[PDB]
Design a protein around this ligand. Structure first.
Ligand code: ZN
Lengths: 145, 244, 195, 49, 49, 293
């Protein structure tokens, strides 16, 4: 990378940006296989989403040379590169329901509170499924009839 | 809801807060807040200003407040939460693995539950557990009881990797042990010039080892560099002439 | 105290253990002595109200500013003393020196006071070393009135930037903000940083 | 026996007791199959500790 | 002494890439690489990400 | 506030089932089944009678939704009590309860109106299986097969009472002589039963990574190994870089070895002997002696 940073800046992410950082989706709870002690397919350690184990090696064993850089194996989908990318590729999870971030809700004062002009207690009631909040009123339809 | 189904809609949950923030427009509240600020009765007004600050932030940023409800969560790379196998056959892992696994579980189970169809109390309970789970993954013990894994030991959260004496911000300030270094007892030597110093030759052999190796394959005393390194390990009489 | 606690406390800017008073205005000495507690009163030269103090008789009445300027002459009431002069023996409190006599004077007091602990044990540092940290203390403002400016009344804000915002809002007919110079301890001022 | 006899002056790095762990069973490396093949010396089931 | 302290804190302790490159360059007899950005930085960013 | 509490409240809000409600749920489930068959038949043909004459069956559908949902409410309070015995060891309390709900939903679908018996026994014996199946799937950090779960359950539960009944620590050999009767499977069973301990519980500082220094010195080894063997020919180095493979590296099959060398007719097995005397040049010069040492 270039050696020239004027300054650093920080901000909020976005689901359309968090999908951009990611290389796969982890959809299985399982970690490494118990028997052979290789990572398990499509979980928190798998080689498909993250990176190969040893340097310049796929998963099934169809390539272990160094001659092939950057090819993606069509039998299991791992990519033969340095194993150091094993700590630079990030996963992503897609939640069937949207949760709130805890940092904007439990801080004092809650900024979510100040944006949505609630008491903090009632915001907590909404988040945790203990109180219904009325989102949108069809005013025009109510005045008409 | 039954009386006026066509007239309002309102959700319980975090999905509700997302439709609320989306229905919310930032520029609209901002002007009214500034007018509140403009007016008198400041003690009541100060409260309107704390709002103004939080709100105007999102206007200047160019970042929508929509990014405060997560439709996806990132997973940290697999190495920064390693699971390495110890010497005695035991597995030694990091705590984040239990949290990510937990959120994955509660997520998959919730989605199949939506597929099957279910009562409202069961779906609302599963949503609740998902929100609380991801909440403890981002920052533990911030809402109710923390989570403990083995033996009533709180789990190190993901916000746990930033704060504290051992966090990532404190790391470079405390100091670490280096390479090419030693230490010993000092005696006075009143023979030395102000820029000289006296160095135990047994220690200055170890300290400069690689350089002695380069010069030692350069001379050709050792056929190969790897062999030469072996030579400096046996303190052979040829290495002192080179170490000078 | 005189040792490294006096030096540490001076940089922290906390209230001293003696906290002898100084003359808030300029006036005339009028001390009545109660056996349990003294009361020190200053009858103003300009006019208006006279300052009142309820100081213990456990300290010692300090030498008075007089034309003779004898340091051995204790304070005898009925006199006219200069504004800011110290009233009793002990340590003047810095925040009061600053609010009474501006930013420069509290600079003088802090340099002299931190130096006077080293000129006793016999060390000597050059004044600029102390001044380079005192400059890092005294360079923010606490704002009495928010006005048309954005920042909250009662917040620790930078000096230069306070001035800039105030002249920008003044450039549009908006009311200025009223801010005063604050002194900070070298732990409550390295907390408020901008990075 | 594997242990140094009593009275032999030892400079550092020397061996005092000779022990071998049964090396973890991996595959024999091909580059190592040719390297060990030219001379004919097998890296046995044991490393040197 | 910017370069000495940046050298102690990076290739002499933490960065694996750095230590490997410096050791190699010393044995090879070429210039030591001029100290750049630690591998630790990208990890701080992956954790903030 | 806390999570288990609010859900206990929700479950306790609706009235528990009894003998009077036996008829109410039995009649409702039977009506619901009839509603399902009558509703299902119309959709398949593609011809449907008016919606005004079908609204009656829609009303039976609302009754059947209060029957499935409210009957479900009656079963939840049982689900909690059945969870109370599993909560200690494996998983969290509410995860277990949620699996009880999920199992119950599967269980309710598989129900027959004609049979009449208490719900504890039938429903309990249907949902305890779901609880134990998901529990046994996701309780461990590293997933294990189900027969290993059974073996570890039996040895662990018999061991825990054997140690305190005997009065002395169970010896490493006889715990296996009870069932496993193998001394090499003890270490293995206790390895599978071990759980991964936290690094934070420093602990990781003791562990050594090794190899960057010797894989660097091994790249240097590859340099010198490439440089030394230059006094030979190209043909002989062909079969040197084929079956063995200096840069390639695979104990390959001799036919595909013969088809990637550009030379066919297996001539390279006949030239393989006409150069072994030349392949004695590096062994007599004793050049590869300093790397295997
Ligand atoms: Zn593959």
């Amino acid at each position: 990378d270039v050696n020239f940073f004027d300054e650093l800046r920080i901000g909020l992410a976005t689901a359309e940006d968090i999908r951009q950082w990611s290389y796969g989706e982890v959809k299985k709870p399982e970690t490494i296989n118990y028997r052979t002690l290789k990572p398990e397919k499509d979980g928190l350690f798998c080689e498909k989403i993250f990176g190969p184990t040893r340097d310049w090696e796929c998963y099934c064993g169809k390539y272990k040379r160094v001659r092939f850089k950057g090819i993606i194996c069509e039998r299991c989908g791992v990519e033969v590169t340095r194993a150091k990318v094993r700590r630079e590729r990030m996963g992503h999870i897609e939640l069937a329901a949207p949760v709130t971030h805890i940092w904007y809700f439990k801080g004092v004062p809650s900024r979510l509170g100040y944006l949505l002009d609630l008491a903090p207690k009632d915001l907590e009631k909404i988040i945790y499924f203990a109180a219904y909040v009325i989102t949108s009123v069809d005013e025009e339809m109510r005045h008409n009839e | 809801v039954d009386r006026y189904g066509e007239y309002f809609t309102g959700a319980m949950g975090a999905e509700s807060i997302q439709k609320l923030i989306e229905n919310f427009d930032i520029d609209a509240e901002a002007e009214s807040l500034r007018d509140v600020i403009r007016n008198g009765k400041g003690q009541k007004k100060l409260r309107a200003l704390k709002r103004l600050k939080v709100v105007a932030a999102f206007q200047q940023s160019g970042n929508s407040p929509m990014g405060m409800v997560l439709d996806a969560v990132p997973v940290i790379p697999p190495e920064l939460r390693p699971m390495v196998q110890l010497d005695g056959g035991r597995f030694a892992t990091s705590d984040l693995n239990d949290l990510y696994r937990r959120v994955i579980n509660r997520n998959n189970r919730l989605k199949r539950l939506i597929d099957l169809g279910a009562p409202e109390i069961i779906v609302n309970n599963e949503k609740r557990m998902l929100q609380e789970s991801v909440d403890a993954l981002f920052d533990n013990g911030r809402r109710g009881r923390p989570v403990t894994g083995p033996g009533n030991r709180p789990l190190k959260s993901l916000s746990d990797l930033l704060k504290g004496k051992q966090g990532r911000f404190r790391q470079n300030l405390l100091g670490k042990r280096v390479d090419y270094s030693g230490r010993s007892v000092i005696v006075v030597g009143p023979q030395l010039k102000l820029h000289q110093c006296g160095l135990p030759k047994l220690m200055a052999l170890e300290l400069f080892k690689p350089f002695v190796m380069k010069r030692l394959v350069d001379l050709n005393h050792a056929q190969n560099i790897k062999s030469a390194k072996r030579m400096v390990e046996r303190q052979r009489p040829q290495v002192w002439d080179v170490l000078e | 105290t005189g040792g490294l606690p006096r030096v540490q406390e001076l940089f922290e800017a906390r209230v001293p253990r003696g906290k002898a008073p100084i003359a808030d205005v300029t006036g005339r000495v009028r001390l009545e002595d109660g056996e349990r507690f003294y009361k020190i009163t200053i009858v103003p030269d300009d006019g208006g109200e006279e300052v009142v103090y309820d100081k213990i008789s456990k300290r010692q009445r300090l030498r008075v500013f007089k034309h003779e300027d004898g340091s051995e002459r204790v304070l005898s009431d009925g006199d006219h003393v200069e504004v800011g002069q110290q009233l009793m023996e002990g340590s003047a409190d810095p925040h009061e020196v600053l609010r009474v006599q501006g930013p420069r004077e509290v600079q003088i007091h802090l340099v002299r006071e931190v130096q006077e602990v080293y000129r006793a044990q016999g060390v000597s540092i050059h004044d600029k070393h102390i001044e380079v940290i005192v400059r890092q203390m005294l360079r923010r403002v606490t704002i009495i009135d928010s006005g048309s400016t954005e920042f909250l009344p009662g917040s620790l804000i930078d000096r230069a930037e306070f001035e800039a915002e105030n002249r920008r809002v003044v450039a549009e007919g908006g009311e200025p903000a009223a801010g005063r110079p604050v002194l900070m301890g070298i732990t409550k001022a390295s907390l408020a940083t901008d990075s | 026996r594997g242990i140094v006899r009593i009275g032999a002056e030892v400079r550092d790095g020397d061996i005092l007791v000779g022990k071998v762990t049964p090396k973890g069973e991996t595959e024999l490396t091909p580059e190592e199959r040719l390297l060990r093949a030219i001379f004919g010396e097998k890296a046995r089931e044991v490393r040197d500790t | 002494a910017a370069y000495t302290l940046q050298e102690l804190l990076t290739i002499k302790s933490d960065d694996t890439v750095g230590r490997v490159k410096v050791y190699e360059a010393i044995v090879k007899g070429e210039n030591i690489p001029e100290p750049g950005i630690p591998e630790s930085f990208k990890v701080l960013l992956k954790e903030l990400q | 506030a806390d999570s288990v509490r609010a859900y206990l409240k929700q479950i306790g809000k609706v009235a528990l089932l009894n003998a009077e409600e036996e008829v109410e749920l039995a009649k409702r489930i039977e009506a619901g089944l009839y509603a399902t068959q009558l509703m299902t038949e119309l959709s398949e043909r593609g011809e449907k009678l008016p919606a005004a004459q079908r609204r009656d069956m829609m009303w039976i559908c609302r009754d059947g939704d209060r029957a499935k949902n409210h009957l479900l409410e009656a079963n939840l309070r049982l689900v909690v009590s059945l969870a109370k015995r599993y909560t200690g060891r494996g998983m969290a309390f509410l995860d277990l309860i949620q699996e009880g709900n999920l199992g119950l939903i599967r269980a309710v679908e598989k129900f027959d109106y004609t049979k009449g018996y208490k719900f504890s026994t039938y429903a309990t014996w249907w949902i305890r299986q779901a609880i134990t199946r998901a529990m046994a799937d996701q309780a461990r950090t590293i997933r294990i097969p189900v027969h290993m779960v059974e073996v570890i359950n039996k040895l662990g539960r018999i061991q825990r009472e054997l140690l305190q009944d005997l009065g002395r620590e169970p010896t490493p050999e006889e715990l296996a002589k009870e069932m496993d009767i193998t001394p090499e499977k003890v270490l293995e069973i206790q390895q599978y039963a071990r759980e991964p301990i936290s690094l934070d519980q420093q602990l990781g500082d003791f562990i050594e990574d090794s190899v960057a220094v010797d894989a660097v010195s091994f790249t240097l080894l590859q340099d010198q190994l490439q440089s030394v063997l230059d006094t030979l020919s190209e043909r002989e180095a062909g079969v040197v870089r084929l079956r063995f493979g200096l840069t390639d590296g695979q104990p390959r099959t001799l036919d595909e070895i013969g088809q990637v060398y550009g030379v066919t007719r297996e001539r390279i097995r006949q030239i393989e002997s006409k150069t072994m005397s030349k392949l004695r040049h590096p062994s007599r010069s004793q050049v590869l002696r300093d790397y295997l040492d």
